[PDB]
Write a protein that binds this ligand. Structure first.
Ligand SMILES: C=CC(=O)N(C)CCOc1ccccc1Oc1cccc2cc(C#N)ccc12
Ligand SMILES: [Mg+2]
Ligand SMILES: [Mg+2]
Lengths: 403, 551
């Protein structure tokens, strides 16, 4: 705890100057309590007007115990300095996620770089200017910290990996991803060991996944007793969409059944060639696509569709129509599960799944008004990271195709 | 006086050196004013004569807007000094103040000159008083305190001020102090007698740190003319708004005009500016003359009516509820009030953004609550209770069927027409016993001429010719047609993704008059169901209007 790794911003790059979002009096108070002690433990110091930098701070909950979350998105883009993501983690039968970010505050931060970590606790109604601090130790949320601490982390895990050669351990930011093909009870026991072996080496720690189920939802066609012009048009319309992706789908026999100028409500019976063309199109949709490959140099994008009744569909891709993963999340109302609650839970699940599988975060196209998000996303946010996002206007002809 | 306060370190932007602007020569009169002002300023330590090895300079000037005053041009220096934490941009809103028993305004005299300048940064402030006709060398000086008009002065001064205050507000948690620029606003609920004592204490405490201040004889009195406001002891209001009367209006005149209207709407319920702003959609040179529209004339006339009355707002009481009401004020226009007691408003405001070509009323009301929520957080650090003219039925149905995620504060319905209603609802299932129109449309992307037609399951087929339209505009006309020529219940079927999305959105107001017409139709209809099929797939019903409109 005396060695200070030197940290430098990418060439010709100044530090963050991100505006601070106003907060409720309840949230400001929680931030002043949190920062008053963090000043006592000497992890942050007050800064003077000769520091122009600024990064936003938010108060979250992760039980009456407020926490503080920092948006280092901008400084992470700007530090970006650096020293084979485990392909087997996604395959493991179990995976548990551990918060090991308190560990960072052991470690001092390069003196010259502290100015860039500046943050403001804002006041109400611009009565006072903010309270301005900057960080003395490695802050949670900065990509720098897991990289600096990498050394100590390998050191502390060498005992445990040697014992357990088949267990996969991957780190992303403040989190350790621990996977066994073990039985569950065994798995949680091996997790407790590593927890204890971490604590007793002085690394405090306070969510278990199962990537052995995650599967790209295949396209699903309705089963109806009596079809109608509408239901055939829907069915031909969807199968038409699916045909930019899967090559084998045909509609000649199915649209043949609509030759005419028919009432929509009219009942059309599924003739054989039509039924046998739809049955074959059900077996083409069972197979997965041909040539879709993860490019590590390119961003991952995630789109989300509100489906009503607590359902949300999502696609992750890097090139339009070339989906890497797809899926659907279902909430349980829980006497609330508001739209924003569900979108926020959903976004975190997609990001974890994305971390597991490729070890980075997707860029989110979010179906919501920007100002609404910027107001309420912290009332349900638990993760210590924050993915990039933008706000879209979802087409209404893709809500139903992904349904 | 100057301050025993510690200095803030300053640096130039890396790889930059100090200004070396040459001094313009001046009039012997102006030289005399500076020489006296500079010896006085020297006698107080604000500046110091320097040797000949300071390469830097910045011009200086003397003038007296018809007492003399010295002004310096720090443009080149300000270009080179580092960036600082942005001094307070936004001021507080009078509606966010808690009523106080006694309140004193203290102006800091010579604020910036009372604070020392960082030592190693002094060399870059050098200036020069010219000798008469360059006969002998002029006199070099440099600053020892915050120069007026330098880039660091506001943030460094404010910083100093805050620390200077700290010890005093540690021994007086009962006294509330705002600092804004060179001013301090101090209030208390102590007895106006002792309150005058604590004001006397603080003045002395500031004098001990170098901050001269006013006396009980010279402290400003209410009402307070502060930042376009009037602050009365029990109430606040804007300063009087005066809107020009002109026969012609330029872009500049209209900008200044919506400004003043925007201003007044924070306390005058009902201001509207939408048609006036629509004029500034031209966004051209500020001198161009804009012929006012009839809608613009009526809006400004109605604004003058409201500004005829006087209004006031009230201060904030943390122990009373916070409540917001919203009213429709006309197509696209809304107005709101925020109050803790029924007739005494903290403030008012308006919302009218369309955010796209087409909208509906529920979407706009929700966007209004959004705007109120953000403003409530900024001003009072909390969100209010909403009283709204919309029933659960209406809103619940809307946000459930809405594809976008949306947050609905708990509200109580208040009945006060115009209530907010869903003027209509497309069908979720096709309609039995209703004629199934197959619409289409088209235009030549070169001649711009076009046709919209339909063919129905009952054998009917039409085609209407269209001039100077676009494949999109015809696609909407096809639907318009099928609504005109239909019974109270119509199944429409289209191949136009464009037109589908515009309709499923269920707008009740629009920019294009076509979409306004379609809405007029949709309302009259009883059941309308709309369906989509991939174009040029030979579906049937769709192949036939395509062939038709093509021939
Ligand atoms: C008696 C009137 C009243 O109740 N006011 C003005 C609001 C009280 O709120 C203050 C609390 C502490 C210190 C000053 C207060 O009052 C002001 C607040 C903000 C800006 C002010 C600006 C001026 C001027 N000029 C005067 C008073 C101000
Ligand atoms: Mg901040
Ligand atoms: Mg067509």
């Amino acid at each position: 705890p005396i060695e200070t790794v030197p940290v430098k911003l990418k060439p010709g790059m100044d530090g963050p100057k991100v505006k601070q979002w106003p907060l409720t009096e309840e949230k400001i108070k929680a931030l002043v309590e949190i920062c008053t002690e963090m000043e006592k433990e000497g992890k942050i110091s007050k800064i003077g007007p000769e520091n122009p930098y600024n990064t936003p701070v938010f108060a979250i909950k992760k039980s009456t115990k407020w926490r503080k979350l920092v948006d280092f998105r901008e400084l992470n883009k700007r530090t970006q300095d650096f020293w084979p993501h485990p392909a087997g983690l996604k395959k493991k039968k179990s995976v548990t996620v551990l918060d090991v970010g308190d560990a960072y505050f052991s470690v001092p931060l390069d003196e010259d770089f502290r100015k860039y970590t500046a943050f403001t606790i804002p006041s109400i109604n611009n009565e006072t200017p903010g309270i301005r601090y900057q960080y003395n130790v490695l802050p949670q949320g900065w990509k720098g910290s897991p990289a600096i601490f990498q050394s100590s982390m390998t050191k502390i895990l060498e005992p445990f990996k040697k014992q357990n050669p088949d267990i996969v351990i991957y780190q992303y930011m403040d989190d350790l991803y621990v996977g066994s093909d073990l039985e569950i009870g065994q798995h949680r026991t091996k997790i407790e060991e590593l927890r204890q072996h971490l604590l007793r080496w002085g690394l405090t720690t306070p969510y278990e996944l199962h990537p052995d189920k995650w599967t790209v939802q295949p396209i699903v066609l309705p089963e109806k007793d009596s079809w109608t012009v509408n239901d055939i048009q829907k069915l031909v319309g969807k199968l038409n969409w699916a045909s930019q992706i899967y090559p084998g789908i045909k509609v000649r026999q199915l649209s043949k059944l609509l030759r005419g100028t028919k009432a929509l409500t009219e009942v059309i019976p599924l003739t054989e060639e039509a039924e046998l063309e739809l049955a074959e199109n059900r077996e083409i949709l069972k197979e997965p696509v041909h040539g879709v490959y993860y490019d590590p140099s390119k961003d991952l994008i995630a789109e989300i569709q509100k489906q009503g009744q607590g359902q949300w569909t999502y696609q992750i891709y890097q090139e339009p129509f070339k989906n890497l993963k797809t899926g659907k999340y279902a909430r349980m109302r829980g006497a609330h599960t508001n739209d924003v609650k569900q979108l926020t839970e959903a976004v975190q699940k997609i990001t974890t799944e994305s971390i597991v599988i490729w070890g980075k975060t997707p860029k989110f196209k979010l179906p919501i008004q920007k100002e609404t998000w910027e107001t309420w996303w912290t009332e349900y946010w638990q993760a210590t990271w924050i993915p990039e996002w933008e706000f879209v206007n979802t087409p209404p002809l893709v809500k139903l195709w992904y349904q | 006086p100057i301050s025993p306060i510690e200095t803030v370190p300053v640096k130039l932007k890396p790889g930059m050196d100090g200004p070396k602007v040459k001094q313009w020569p001046l009039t012997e009169e102006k030289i005399k004013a500076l020489v006296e002002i500079c010896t006085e300023m020297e006698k107080e330590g604000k500046i110091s004569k320097i040797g000949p090895e300071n390469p830097y300079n910045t011009p200086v000037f003397a003038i007296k807007k018809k007492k003399w005053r010295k002004l310096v041009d720090f443009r080149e220096l300000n270009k080179r000094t580092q960036d600082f934490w942005e001094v307070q941009l936004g001021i507080p809103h009078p509606a966010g103040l808690k009523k106080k028993k006694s309140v004193t305004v203290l102006d800091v005299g010579d604020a910036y000159f009372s604070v020392p300048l960082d030592e190693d940064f002094r060399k870059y402030t050098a200036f020069t008083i010219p000798s008469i006709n360059n006969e002998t060398p002029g006199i070099r000086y440099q600053y020892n305190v915050l120069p007026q008009g330098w880039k660091g002065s506001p943030a460094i001064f404010q910083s100093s001020m805050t620390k200077i205050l700290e010890p005093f507000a540690a021994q007086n948690p009962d006294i509330v102090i705002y600092q804004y620029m060179d001013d301090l606003y101090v209030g208390s609920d102590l007895e106006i007698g002792q309150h005058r004592t604590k004001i006397e204490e603080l003045r002395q405490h500031l004098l001990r740190w170098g901050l001269t201040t006013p006396d009980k004889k010279h402290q400003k009195e209410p009402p307070f003319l502060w930042m376009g406001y009037e602050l009365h002891p029990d109430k606040w209001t804007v300063q009087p708004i005066v809107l020009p009367e002109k026969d012609s209006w330029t872009v500049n005149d209209i900008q200044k005009l919506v400004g003043k209207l925007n201003w007044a709407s924070q306390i005058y319920p009902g201001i509207k500016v939408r048609q006036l702003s629509k004029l500034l959609r031209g966004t051209k040179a500020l001198t161009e003359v804009i012929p006012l529209t009839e809608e613009a004339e009526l809006e400004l006339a109605e604004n003058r009516e409201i500004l005829k009355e006087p209004v006031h707002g009230v201060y904030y009481d943390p122990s009373k509820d916070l409540i917001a009401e919203i009213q429709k004020q006309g197509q696209g226009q809304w107005t709101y009030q925020i109050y803790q007691e029924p007739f005494k408003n903290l403030k008012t405001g308006k919302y009218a953004r369309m955010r796209g070509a087409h909208t509906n009323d529920v979407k706009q009301l929700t966007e209004a609550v959004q705007k109120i929520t953000t403003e409530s957080i900024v001003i009072w650090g909390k969100t209010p209770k909403f009283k709204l003219p919309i029933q659960k039925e209406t809103w619940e149905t809307w946000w459930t069927e809405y594809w976008q995620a949306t947050w609905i504060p708990e509200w109580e319905f208040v009945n006060t027409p115009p209530l907010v209603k869903l003027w209509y609802q497309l069908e979720k299932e096709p309609i039995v016993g209703a004629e199934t129109f197959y619409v289409d449309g088209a235009a030549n992307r070169e001649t711009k001429l076009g046709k919209a037609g339909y063919v129905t399951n009952k054998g009917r087929q039409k085609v209407v010719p269209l001039t100077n339209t676009t494949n999109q505009k015809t696609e909407l006309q096809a639907i318009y047609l099928a609504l005109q020529d239909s019974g109270l219940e119509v199944n429409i079927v289209t191949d136009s993704q464009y037109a589908l999305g515009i309709i499923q959105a269920q707008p009740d107001k629009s920019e294009s008059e076509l979409v306004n017409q379609i809405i007029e139709q949709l309302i009259k209809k009883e059941k309308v169901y709309l369906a989509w099929v991939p174009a040029h797939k030979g579906i049937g019903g769709n192949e036939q209007v395509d062939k038709l409109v093509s021939a």
